[PDB]
Amino acid sequence: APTNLEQVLAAGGNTVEMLRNSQIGAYVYPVVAPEFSNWRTEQWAWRNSAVLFDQTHHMVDLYIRGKDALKLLSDTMINSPKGWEPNKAKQYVPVTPYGHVIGDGIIFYLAEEEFVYVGRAPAANWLMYHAQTGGYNVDIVHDDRSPSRPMGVQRISWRFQIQGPKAWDVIEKLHGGTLEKLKFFNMAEMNIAGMKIRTLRHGMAGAPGLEIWGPYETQEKARNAILEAGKEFGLIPVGSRAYPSNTLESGWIPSPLPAIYTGDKLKAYREWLPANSYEASGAIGGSFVSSNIEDYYVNPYEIGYGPFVKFDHDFIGRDALEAIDPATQRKKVTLAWNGDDMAKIYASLFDTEADAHYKFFDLPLANYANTNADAVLDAAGNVVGMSMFTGYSYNEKRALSLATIDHEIPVGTELTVLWGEENGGTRKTTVEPHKQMAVRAVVSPVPYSVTA
Amino acid sequence: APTNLEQVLAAGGNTVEMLRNSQIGAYVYPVVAPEFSNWRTEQWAWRNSAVLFDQTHHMVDLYIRGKDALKLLSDTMINSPKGWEPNKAKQYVPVTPYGHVIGDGIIFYLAEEEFVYVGRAPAANWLMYHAQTGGYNVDIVHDDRSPSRPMGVQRISWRFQIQGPKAWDVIEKLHGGTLEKLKFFNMAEMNIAGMKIRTLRHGMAGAPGLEIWGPYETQEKARNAILEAGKEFGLIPVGSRAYPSNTLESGWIPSPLPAIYTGDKLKAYREWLPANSYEASGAIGGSFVSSNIEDYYVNPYEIGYGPFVKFDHDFIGRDALEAIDPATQRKKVTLAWNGDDMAKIYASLFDTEADAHYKFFDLPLANYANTNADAVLDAAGNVVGMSMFTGYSYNEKRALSLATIDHEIPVGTELTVLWGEENGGTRKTTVEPHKQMAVRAVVSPVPYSVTA
Numbered sequence: 020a021p022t023n024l025e026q027v028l029a030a031g032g033n034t035v036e037m038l039r040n041s042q043i044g045a046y047v048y049p050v051v052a053p054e055f056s057n058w059r060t061e062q063w064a065w066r067n068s069a070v071l072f073d074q075t076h077h078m079v080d081l082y083i084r085g086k087d088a089l090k091l092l093s094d095t096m097i098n099s100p101k102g103w104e105p106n107k108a109k110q111y112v113p114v115t116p117y118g119h120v121i122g123d124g125i126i127f128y129l130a131e132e133e134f135v136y137v138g139r140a141p142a143a144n145w146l147m148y149h150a151q152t153g154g155y156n157v158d159i160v161h162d163d164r165s166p167s168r169p170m171g172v173q174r175i176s177w178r179f180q181i182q183g184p185k186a187w188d189v190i191e192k193l194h195g196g197t198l199e200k201l202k203f204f205n206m207a208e209m210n211i212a213g214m215k216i217r218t219l220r221h222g223m224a225g226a227p228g229l230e231i232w233g234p235y236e237t238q239e240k241a242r243n244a245i246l247e248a249g250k251e252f253g254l255i256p257v258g259s260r261a262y263p264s265n266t267l268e269s270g271w272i273p274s275p276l277p278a279i280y281t282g283d284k285l286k287a288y289r290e291w292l293p294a295n296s297y298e299a300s301g302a303i304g305g306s307f308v309s310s311n312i313e314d315y316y317v318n319p320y321e322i323g324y325g326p327f328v329k330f331d332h333d334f335i336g337r338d339a340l341e342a343i344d345p346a347t348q349r350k351k352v353t354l355a356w357n358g359d360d361m362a363k364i365y366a367s368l369f370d371t372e373a374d375a376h377y378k379f380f381d382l383p384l385a386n387y388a389n390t391n392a393d394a395v396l397d398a399a400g401n402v403v404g405m406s407m408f409t410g411y412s413y414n415e416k417r418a419l420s421l422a423t424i425d426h427e428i429p430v431g432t433e434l435t436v437l438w439g440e441e442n443g444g445t446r447k448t449t450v451e452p453h454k455q456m457a458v459r460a461v462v463s464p465v466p467y468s469v470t471a
Numbered sequence: 472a473p474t475n476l477e478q479v480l481a482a483g484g485n486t487v488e489m490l491r492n493s494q495i496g497a498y499v500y501p502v503v504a505p506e507f508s509n510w511r512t513e514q515w516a517w518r519n520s521a522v523l524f525d526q527t528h529h530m531v532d533l534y535i536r537g538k539d540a541l542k543l544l545s546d547t548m549i550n551s552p553k554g555w556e557p558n559k560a561k562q563y564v565p566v567t568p569y570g571h572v573i574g575d576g577i578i579f580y581l582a583e584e585e586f587v588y589v590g591r592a593p594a595a596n597w598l599m600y601h602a603q604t605g606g607y608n609v610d611i612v613h614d615d616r617s618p619s620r621p622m623g624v625q626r627i628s629w630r631f632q633i634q635g636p637k638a639w640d641v642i643e644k645l646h647g648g649t650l651e652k653l654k655f656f657n658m659a660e661m662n663i664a665g666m667k668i669r670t671l672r673h674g675m676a677g678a679p680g681l682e683i684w685g686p687y688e689t690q691e692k693a694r695n696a697i698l699e700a701g702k703e704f705g706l707i708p709v710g711s712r713a714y715p716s717n718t719l720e721s722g723w724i725p726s727p728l729p730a731i732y733t734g735d736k737l738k739a740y741r742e743w744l745p746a747n748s749y750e751a752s753g754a755i756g757g758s759f760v761s762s763n764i765e766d767y768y769v770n771p772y773e774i775g776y777g778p779f780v781k782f783d784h785d786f787i788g789r790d791a792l793e794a795i796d797p798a799t800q801r802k803k804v805t806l807a808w809n810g811d812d813m814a815k816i817y818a819s820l821f822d823t824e825a826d827a828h829y830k831f832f833d834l835p836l837a838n839y840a841n842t843n844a845d846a847v848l849d850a851a852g853n854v855v856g857m858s859m860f861t862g863y864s865y866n867e868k869r870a871l872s873l874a875t876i877d878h879e880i881p882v883g884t885e886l887t888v889l890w891g892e893e894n895g896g897t898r899k900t901t902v903e904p905h906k907q908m909a910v911r912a913v914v915s916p917v918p919y920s921v922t923a
Contacts, residue, residue, distance in 0.1 A: 044506075044507060044508060045506060045509070047504075050622050050623070051622065052499075052619075052620040052622070053505065054496075054497060054901075055496060055620075055900070056496060056900035056901065057497070057831070057839075057900065057901050057902070057903060059831060059903040060900070060903055063903075167504075168504040168507075170502050170503065170504070170624065171502070171624040171625060172622065172623040173623060358818075358821030358822060358823065359821075361818075361820075361821040362814065362817065362818035362821055365814065365817040365818070366810075366813075366814035366817070366818070368813075368834075368863070368868065369810030369811075369813040369814055369868060369869065369870065370810060370868060371810065371867070371868045371869065376868075379509070379511060382820075387509075411820070413903075415823070416820065416821060416822060416823045416828075417821065417823065418821065448507070448508035448509065448512070449506075449508065449509050450509070451509060451511040451512055451515075451865075
């Protein structure tokens with residue numbers, strides 16, 4: 020019966036209970052093979068040789084064109100539009116009128132009146148709603164992410180990254196000569212196998228690399244040229260199992276809850292969002308329990324986007340962000356999970372006498388919902404933060420999670436993350452029956468580096 | 472340059488070294504989603520509720536027709552053809568002229584002069600070679616397994632299994648009434664959503680179920696009807712991550728090495744097999760090291776097929792099998808791996824000081840080659856067997872492997888499995904650097920049951 024989010028929530032009871040018991044299944048990264056060699060060697064290669072990341076299938080693309088394209092972005096992003104010219108990209112972050120993050124994505128300024136958004140569904144849905152209902156003179160082509168269980172896939176564009184300490188060597192070999200390293204997120208072009216390929220300056224683990232894209236038809240020509248040229252430097256392709264664990268080392272939180280489930284000013288959006296949207300159908304997992312869905316919201320300062328906020332243009336939520344004191348907001352950190360506790364979690368899987376075991380911690384990514392929310396506790400047992408993305412780095416031989424915690428907690432402090440859900444687990448299909456564990460974890464910098 | 476297996480081996484040096492260092496990557500089970508709920512709940516369901524197994528994509532189908540179809544099978548199988556009529560299936564097992572297993576598959580006798588083979592590539596390749604070169608009056612359609620990394624799949628037929636303690640309840644609900652349980656591997660039909668669907672009597676974990684198949688076009692009608700009717704009984708679909716671990720509880724060894732790399736009588740076959748065949752391109756993994764590829768061969772008695780051998784028809788390898796004493800052959804067993812040792816293997820992944828860790832043991836399937844060969848040792852350190860398929864059962868909370876061991880070793884005996892490869896690991900792309908561990912393991916019955 021329901022055809023929009025507002026109807027789903029009205030018929031669904033408590034919104035937190037609905038989402039924490041959703042029957043959707045796992046947030047999937049589709050089409051790309053799980054592994055090409057193995058996820059451990061693939062993780063190792065982005066720190067020690069070079070990798071080809073295949074980004075063609077897991078993200079939504081919005082092609083945004085027309086006279087009002089830039090005004091649509093400016094009106095909805097915290098980011099400064101001043102001085103923004105073609106061939107520069109931005110990490111677009113929209114907030115609600117209440118100041119909470121909806122999502123984020125990369126917005127490429129390709130040419131005058133021509134932009135592309137690449138990212139997850141929530142910020143794309145927001146852009147489409149405002150383009151639709153706000154009277155902007157704009158034209159949008161929506162190209163959804165590929166189906167997460169296709170079983171018998173095409174996009175408008177392919178998108179790759181070449182990364183690692185040897186990435187620039189591979190890139191210049193492909194180019195046929197020296198390639199200037201522009202400033203981060205500046206765009207230009209390079210040669211691959213006779214094609215002019217547009218580039219986006221990128222990098223990771225302290226080494227510069229590129230994102231590259233083009234029309235879907237040249238995808239295999241490009242890929243084979245990259246793999247061929249990269250053999251000299253140890254370049255290997257990375258599969259969908261390893262790929263999303265990279266952000267545990269980077270620090271980008273992919274999955275803040277879209278903060279759109281409450282609020283009178285957001286009712287029109289909820290009536291617009293379909294009942295099978297990401298927002299209506301997805302799931303929340305982890306140990307943090309509140310009866311108020313707003314307790315799962317974050318604002319930009321809490322997850323590392325404070326420096327993007329610029330009060331130099333009108334935008335949705337500007338007044339709410341101006342009223343925030345940035346100096347007292349929770350801060351994004353990396354939590355380094357205690358390895359003895361990790362061994363205890365895995366050991367319980369092989370205990371034939373125990374009534375229960377600890378929640379299964381998949382590797383290298385242990386998330387078991389689309390939005391992750393584990394409680395972070397201090398020595399006294401107070402909730403002091405929210406852990407939001409969890410997994411393991413073969414490079415560090417450490418389990419790690421990305422969290423937002425009370426600002427006055429120093430690096431090096433040992434907190435605990437409550438791992439697992441209450442009462443044997445929610446009804447999500449990703450959750451086997453289990454008991455919880457308070458995992459010791461050391462507050463560490465973001466991007467991750469070893470602490471104490 | 473090489474276009475057949477014989478050329479590959481001639482140019483490849485020692486055959487064991489070639490296969491144990493193959494660059495192929497992982498033996499994949501493709502197209503089907505890795506998980507629908509989670510592999511732990513999916514394993515649990517085939518013992519506690521019901522499951523839908525999607526078998527449409529991972530096996531080769533050979534449609535074999537014509538006057539000499541049955542003679543082709545009889546001439547190449549150890550199995551008795553006497554009394555074989557349409558609507559009975561057999562587990563077809565071919566051996567070489569030297570008595571060693573090539574492979575196995577299920578052969579359906581659909582009608583007079585009409586058979587279908589379903590199974591892995593090695594026995595299909597053997598059937599095709601003999602159909603091609605032996606002058607049989609036969610016609611064959613080869614329908615390969617689906618591509619193991621497609622990324623943008625069709626078969627001639629879909630194939631499902633409905634299994635679990637509640638499978639027969641689901642089956643009769645679909646049928647619309649009582650359905651007779653025929654003898655194992657006898658074929659008949661049932662109703663699903665108005666279609667007449669052919670059936671194969673099957674079962675697992677002590678409960679009867681069915682394999683069902685039909686033309687590829689009716690696949691979704693059938694699947695949706697099954698999932699719909701099965702909700703009442705807790706039926707869930709199983710993904711490709713959990714599915715192949717089922718045989719650790721069943722006892723079927725899927726992957727004996729095709730014993731075709733040596734022998735003057737097999738040179739013609741090696742010249743026929745393509746250079747990109749399964750046999751030429753695949754990999755051997757594990758701790759068992761010999762310089763003679765024949766030390767990796769098994770004969771039917773060693774892996775549970777002794778009872779199929781019937782000296783009532785002429786067949787390839789009959790004379791070799793008649794010369795074997797079945798009472799002294801190695802015997803298939805289940806090894807139950809020690810859970811403290813398993814915890815130690817996983818614990819080494821989180822040790823930030825250790826120079827090395829133990830070989831990664833993936834879950835629920837830990838195989839890291841197409842053919843698995845781990846050394847099984849006694850208390851004195853002699854090799855007494857070969858472990859051939861390895862993983863973990865959430866139903867048992869135990870790591871398990873399927874092995875063939877010296878016949879005089881009693882159930883309940885504690886042996887060790889050498890887990891991991893020598894010298895930091897072979898050059899296979901599935902192998903991260905690691906040290907070995909001698910894992911304690913208790914000889915247990917096959918199909919698995921708890922011992923002592």
